[PDB]
Amino acid sequence: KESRIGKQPITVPANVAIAMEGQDLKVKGPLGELSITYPREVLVEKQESGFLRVRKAVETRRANQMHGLFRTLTDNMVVGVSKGFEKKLQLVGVGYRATVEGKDLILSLGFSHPVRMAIPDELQVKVEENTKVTVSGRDKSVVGQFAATIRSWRPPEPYKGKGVRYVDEVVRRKEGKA
Amino acid sequence: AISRTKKEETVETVQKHLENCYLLAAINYKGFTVKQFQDLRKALPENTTLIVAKNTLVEKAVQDTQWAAIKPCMKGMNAWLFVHSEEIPIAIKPYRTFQKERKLEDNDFTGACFEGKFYGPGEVKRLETMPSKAEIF
Amino acid sequence: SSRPQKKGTAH
Amino acid sequence: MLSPKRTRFRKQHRGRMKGISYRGNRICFGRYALQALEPAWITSRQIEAGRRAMTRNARRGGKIWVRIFPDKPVTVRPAETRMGSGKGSPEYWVAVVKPGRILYEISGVAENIARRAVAIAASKMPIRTQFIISG
Amino acid sequence: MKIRASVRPICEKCRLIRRRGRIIVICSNPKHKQRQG
């Protein structure tokens, strides 16, 4: 009940259509549709002033953790269908490059083969041949995921900073060879 | 923190610096060096008193001394000027020139109080044009 | 291992 | 290594360890102290090590009293020695401590350096212990 | 990652977490990573 997260109500802006059936929430915003189901304890209230205030059926430690989580969840699916989410990763090195073509993202990371990546519907990936890549999508979870999958292939190494990194990163740089 | 005794003696020292002075000057500061703080404190303590205080610490010290019409000046950060000795224009004039050098250094003039009356950010221009005690007398 | 077990009537 | 200079009989009874020690209970010398929580047998080597550890970790802090001492002998029979034909040879010396007993006393430091030093001391002890402050 | 019975924060930036029942130490620098066990 006293989580500084669950007390703050969520603002649903105009352009945002909120359809509530029981514990199941379907939001249709400018960019598309997002669906989630709530657990037993969490009761989210759709106000008359156009706000979302989260309340909880009982207080277990369980439900406390729960309502904090879900207030942030559905704030992120609201702000997700309204505006959207952009994860941006740049690549550092010699010969490193990326090309979006049709349904694939082609990565040349210095492997023998070109790495092919199937891009999901919900995502739109913009590419700078200047070795930057931004992915935009309405769901924070899925964009974050795919971003990580990119970064996975060649994680940033310590010495020369080479590899795929997020736009803002502290990369421990050891001095090799001294 | 600060004990209630130290804050009652601080509001009492600010009220005793309030009763002797004829004019108030409100100034807010965010993101500035200590060097120009100590140059402003080379120029100020000579002719005038400068006191940096909390919103409520200024509230309960000014309400009683009948400076209350200055209550909207206490929203946001608060640094104050009382004139104990020298005139009003010799204190108010350096602060606006220091706000024209502080344009990129983040200073703004909220308001001043003279004759028991409240003058806004632009109405203190008059308080700057006033002459020294040699020209008035 | 410096501890024994409980055999028979002990147990 | 602490040890008695003389005794008549070499060999001695295991004895039996019971109760509280009411006498060594107080802290009469220093400021902070290490108190023995449990009924055990301290070899001279352990006291040595604990003292050395506390001494080195304290250094610039002044004083360490050792409030105990290993005056009771202990005997062992060699390896592959069939049982019978006499009690064995005394190898080492132990001190018998019971719960409540004080081991180490320490003075000349802030309470922090003392808590840390006493911890490193209690690490070489066979027994559970406690940190106490003078009254 | 070191694995040991006794895990302590070895500096200021260290953090003791609980992951799937086991106690771990995550830090800024990789040498201070530990797992209980």
């Binding site: - | 060097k35 100590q38 404190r41 080379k42 303590p45 | - | - | -």
Partner: protein, 133 residues
């Protein structure tokens, strides 16, 4: 912007100064003779100097405090300070040498009075082992 330590009326040796601030694009003879003229206007002492440089290679420099350790080494008549300050005392200076070293170093301090400068110099002399009364 670079910080160097130079002698009073002597400038432009090859190893200490010229290459160091001359690889940042600073003119050597103008800085060295302006610094010798500015140490000829004040009392000549060893000066740590901060030389600020700009994109057009022009430069403006501020002469910092002539060291209170060097001024209190020449005021107590000694050369080397005390290896263990406040344990072994290597000399003594009067309060008038306090006000003198705090008048020469007064344009270079942040102090608002002469008593603050005098207690600053008494603190530095309490720091290098030199007694003051």
């Amino acid at each position: 912007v670079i910080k160097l330590a130079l002698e009073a009326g002597k400038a432009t040796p090859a190893p200490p100064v010229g290459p160091a601030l001359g690889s940042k694009g600073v003119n050597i003879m103008a800085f060295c003779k302006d610094y010798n003229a500015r140490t000829a206007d004040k009392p000549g002492f060893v000066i740590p100097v901060e030389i600020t440089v700009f994109d057009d290679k022009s430069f403006t420099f501020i002469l910092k405090t002539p060291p209170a350790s060097v001024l209190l080494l020449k005021a107590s008549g000694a050369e080397k300070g005390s290896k263990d300050p406040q344990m072994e005392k290597v000399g003594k200076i009067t309060i008038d040498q306090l006000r003198g070293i705090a008048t020469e170093k007064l344009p270079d301090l942040n102090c608002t009075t002469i008593e603050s400068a005098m207690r600053i110099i008494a603190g530095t002399a309490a720091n290098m082992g030199i007694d003051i009364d």
